[PDB]
Design a protein. Structure first.
Ligand SMILES: Cc1ccc(NC(=O)c2ccc(CN3CCN(C)CC3)cc2)cc1Nc1nccc(-c2cccnc2)n1
Ligand SMILES: O=C(NC1=NN(c2ccc(Cl)c(Cl)c2)C[C@@H]1CCO)c1ccncc1
Length: 264
């Protein structure tokens, strides 16, 4: 039992978070600080592996581990709770006059900061998308990884290479050779930017999954969405270079957004 172990009685367990939306994740209260928290429970090797990774990740724009309970079952991983929930539903439901261009820029800047941190620490996300991001008060955004490929119903994830892939977020070299890297996260970030610019539309709208790889290999890319600043679309296209080594680093992306943000 290490530094992160907390006593189970420190947490008040309430209902499943979203009533089952996230699997075995519960809304809780960290009583001594009057804070709402999220609590993932084991309904083992992989569970503890996730906790070990999260002990190494500390950044304002990444979901923050608060503690674990590992002395008796059920095991808990406890994180902060984010008031406004996941970014995809937030974008689809928000007041667009409040969530204007400078706010969307601010959210993209924060996500790129989180990814620059993972890049610096030699982590790979592998499933970056608006559905894996969270929104808090004052337009805070945090990147998370909810393990959605096993949870979500619908066509977001579909069978490929013997697993479940979010095809329309997946870099070509990942689709073709199952090669994942920080550069395939850069590709997914470009799709995430498009989700932000459209307030959460599904990407390649109207295009069947069966066509996506062929179109990408033949240099098709989503056109600039309505109202998207040209400089932001320029960054999108750079994220979608066919060769992973031609894509910018997250350090470069964040620098670009930071410059854009302070000039606004
Ligand atoms: C309760 C919990 C337990 C674990 C996690 N873990 C992560 O979010 C995560 C993030 C990044 C990594 C990094 N990792 C690097 C390696 N690659 C391959 C995978 C990613 C791992 C786990 C989150 C949570 N939090 C969580 N889970 C589900 C829903 C919510 C939630 C929902 C609504 C409002 N507020 C919070 N909050
Ligand atoms: O104008 C539309 N979207 C928009 N994207 N912009 C933007 C700005 C910064 C980033 Cl970083 C990204 Cl990604 C995108 C701004 C603009 C909205 C603000 O005016 C829009 C029109 C019609 N339907 C849906 C959306």
């Amino acid at each position: 039992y290490d530094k992160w172990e907390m006593e189970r009685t420190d947490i008040t367990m309430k209902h499943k978070l979203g009533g089952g939306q996230y699997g075995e994740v519960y809304e809780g209260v960290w009583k001594k600080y009057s804070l709402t928290v999220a609590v993932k429970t084991l309904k083992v090797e992989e569970f503890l592996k996730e906790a070990a990774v999260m002990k190494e990740i500390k950044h304002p724009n990444l979901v923050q581990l608060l503690g674990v309970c590992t002395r008796e079952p059920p095991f808990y991983i406890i994180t902060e709770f984010m008031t406004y929930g996941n970014l995809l539903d937030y974008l689809r439901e928000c007041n667009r006059q409040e969530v204007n261009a400078v706010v969307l820029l601010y959210m993209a800047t924060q996500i790129s900061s989180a990814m620059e941190y993972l890049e610096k620490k030699n982590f790979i996300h592998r499933d970056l998308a608006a559905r894996n991001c969270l929104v808090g008060e004052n337009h805070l955004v945090k990147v998370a990884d909810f393990g959605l490929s096993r949870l979500m119903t619908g066509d977001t994830y579909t069978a490929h290479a013997g697993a479940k892939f979010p095809i329309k977020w997946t870099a070509p070299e990942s689709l073709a050779y199952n090669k994942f890297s920080i550069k395939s996260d850069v590709w997914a970030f470009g799709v995430l930017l498009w989700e932000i610019a459209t307030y959460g539309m599904s990407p390649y709208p109207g295009i069947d999954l069966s066509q996506v790889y062929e179109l990408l290999e033949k240099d098709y890319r989503m056109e600039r969405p309505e109202g998207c600043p040209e400089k932001v679309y320029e960054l999108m296209r750079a994220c979608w270079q066919w060769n992973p080594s031609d894509r910018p680093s997250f350090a470069e992306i964040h620098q670009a957004f930071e410059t854009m943000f302070q000039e606004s």
